[PDB]
Design a protein around this ligand. Structure first.
Ligand SMILES: [Zn+2]
Lengths: 233, 99
């Protein structure tokens, strides 16, 4: 389902966070890793956030390998995590919002929603973020923002993405000229059979509200152009 | 030629690996990261977005503290010492409030 169930398959929001006082996963010890996941189990594992629901912590060590398979194929976790002995996934019973632990960064909040619903997803990622942040001193700095392992994520720590099925735009050959237009607007589109994924190119400089607004405007224009081209053929 | 006092990384190590080791690498490679940020974020180098709720107090305070330390410097220069005693005690008050 979702608002534009026909055009956009999903809207994703991803917030990378790190503990201030714990080394990042590039340098941290196993004790530090197990302690992060233990802190999450103790103060979030069976807790609710109203509107979003009950969270439950799935630790990798205790998961069935086929259970790991299912989480991977639902995009709740990246493959590297399945063989990590310390990674985790705090899932809502809804399953739309997940919190990956001990991967590239200490924390990665994910909101995967089905339709064209970027700003709802953003709102939920923010709720989750605020909820975690009342128990976790985040790695933050006034000039740089939210501090991340890779330099490509520093600042808002936010990756926003939208999945789109544009058969008519590809068929009407418009796709060719649209792609450079998308790239000059500071968005990266990677094609992944007529499925494309647009997402924000940068994470530092803009604000999150504006990152999501920019992506949202562009997606909406693509939705209108696709409905037009489909009405044409 | 520095290394991070928290996770030990050097800037050459950072060049090879491509990832920061801990939170403090950011402070101890501040200068060198700015060219990298510029390349990666279309010339942007300063954050213009969210601030977490609990800590936002702390950082507001620290900004005040730095503004008053600069004002204190200027006040000492002018030989305006009663004002300087005030500013010193205010800085001390805000720093106590942090911890
Ligand atoms: Zn470090």
């Amino acid at each position: 389902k979702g608002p534009e169930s026909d055009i956009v398959l999903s809207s994703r929001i991803r917030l990378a966070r790190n503990f201030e006082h714990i080394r990042f996963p590039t340098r941290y010890s196993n004790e530090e890793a197990s302690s992060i996941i233990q802190q999450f189990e103790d103060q979030f594992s069976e807790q609710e956030i109203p509107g979003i629901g009950k969270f439950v912590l799935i630790r990798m060590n205790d998961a069935q390998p086929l259970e790991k398979r299912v989480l991977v194929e639902k995009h709740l976790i990246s493959p590297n995590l399945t063989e990590s002995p310390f990674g985790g996934c705090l899932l809502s019973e809804n399953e739309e919002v997940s919190v990956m632990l001990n991967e590239e960064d200490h924390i990665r909040i994910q909101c995967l929603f089905p339709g064209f619903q970027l700003l709802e997803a953003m709102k939920a990622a923010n709720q989750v973020d605020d909820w975690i942040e009342e128990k976790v001193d985040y790695a933050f700095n006034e000039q740089r923002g939210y501090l991340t392992s890779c330099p490509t994520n520093v600042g808002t720590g936010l990756r926003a993405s939208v999945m789109m099925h544009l058969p008519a735009l590809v068929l009407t050959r418009q796709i060719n000229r649209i792609i450079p237009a998308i790239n000059q607007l500071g968005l990266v589109v990677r094609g992944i059979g007529n499925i494309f994924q647009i997402s924000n190119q940068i994470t530092l400089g803009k604000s999150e509200q504006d990152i999501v607004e920019d992506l949202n405007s562009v997606a909406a224009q693509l939705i209108e152009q696709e409905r037009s081209a489909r009405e044409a053929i | 030629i520095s290394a991070c006092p928290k996770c030990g990384m050097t800037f050459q190590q950072f060049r090879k690996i491509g990832r920061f080791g801990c939170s403090e690498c950011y402070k101890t490679f501040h200068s060198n990261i700015t060219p990298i940020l510029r390349k990666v974020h279309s010339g942007n180098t300063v954050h213009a977005g969210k601030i977490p709720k609990r800590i936002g107090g702390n950082l507001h305070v620290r900004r005040q503290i730095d503004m008053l330390k600069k004002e204190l410097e200027s006040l000492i220069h002018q030989e305006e010492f009663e004002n300087a005693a005030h500013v010193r005690d205010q800085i001390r008050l805000l720093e106590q409030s942090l911890k």
